Structure 1
Amino acid sequence: IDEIKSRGYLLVGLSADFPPFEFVDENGNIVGFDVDLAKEIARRLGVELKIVDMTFDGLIPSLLTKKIDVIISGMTITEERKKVVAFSDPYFDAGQVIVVRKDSDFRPKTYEDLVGKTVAVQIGTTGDIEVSKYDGIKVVRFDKFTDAFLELKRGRADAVVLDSATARAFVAKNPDLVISSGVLSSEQYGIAVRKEDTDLLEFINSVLRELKKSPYDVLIEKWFS
């Protein structure tokens, strides 16, 4: 925390291929729900925000090597990831969906409906992790969701598997695609920090709980707590 203030910025790592959380706008800028969160934390620390955009699967390792301060990148909290990083309070709820081409009679509803099919995923995601559990699925793994979608649009893969909110945003810009399934999991997004940075995490959870407090709730707290 003191070190972040010396440096004069909070260094946040994300992969900007995940609207509406992180993504590239028409002018070339990284924007989204997570970008806003990150600005808030920075401002509340009295420092500037510095964003680095990288491969999603590389986020944890570069947190662990001190190349970034924190991960804000639509990252699902998982028992597995908890082995190596710490998570803030949850800040969003989503789950996996299956995206396919519109001009197709293909409409899978379950993971099992993908046995025999070629499914595109972002490497290291919970999408990746679930489909990897079924041996019948030909899993095709990409760094960026941008390429997973090109692969589906051209018909070389039969589906993309990815988080519901982001699936909706990609389908809105790609009328050739449709979400064929219901939500297949219960996932929550968290902000990741190194386990040793316990002050940073406390502060971040505290920014998170304030955000969810109306000025009414804050006023109640003032007089009743």
Structure 2
Amino acid sequence: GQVIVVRKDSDFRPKTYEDLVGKTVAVQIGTTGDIEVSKYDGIKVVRFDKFTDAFLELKRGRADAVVLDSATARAFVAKNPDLVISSGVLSS
């Protein structure tokens, strides 16, 4: 389902929703990722029209993570080696 993407050039390696509490997390608005992260008190959720804009926030350092669907996240990270998928499939 969902995975957590973070910067490769970081020691931050979240594996669960709880690991995102306190962090700025970019999501594509209205996706499962948005809906799920929004359930956890203390995640600072930043919503974007396009997932690519969520990823841009992460690449620039203005967000700490992105939560998105596995296949879409994989196809993007494939071409963005400054990013890494730090989780397996999240248990939602």
Superposition deviation, residue 111 in structure 1: 0.2
Cα distance in structure 2, aligned partners of 1:100 and 1:154: 11
Superposition deviation, residue 104 in structure 1: 0.3
Answer 1 or 2: higher relative contact order, Cα 8 Å, separation at least 6: 2
Say how many residue pairs are matched.
Answer: 92
Q: Counterpart in 2 of 1:150? A: 56
Superposition deviation, residue 98 in structure 1: 0.1
Q: Any unmatched runs of 5+ in structure 1? A: 1-94, 187-225
Cα distance in structure 1, aligned partners of 2:69 and 2:3: 6
**What is the CA RMSD across the aligned residues, in angstroms?**
1.0
Cα distance per residue 1:55-78 (max 9 Å; x no partner): xxxxxxxxxxxxxxxxxxxxxxxx
Q: Counterpart in 2 of 1:168? A: 74
Match status 1:96 vs 2:5: no
Cα distance in structure 1, aligned partners of 2:53 and 2:12: 21
Superposition deviation, residue 166 in structure 1: 1.0
Q: Counterpart in 2 of 1:32? A: none
Cα distance in structure 2, aligned partners of 1:146 and 1:133: 23
Query: Rg bigger for which structure?
Result: 1
**Structure 1 moving runs of 4+ over 6 Å:** none
Q: For 1:181, which of 71, 81, 87 is the aligned residue?
A: 87
Cα distance in structure 2, aligned partners of 1:121 and 1:159: 9
**The structure with more helix, counted as a fraction of residues:** 1
Percent identical pairs in the alignment equals 100
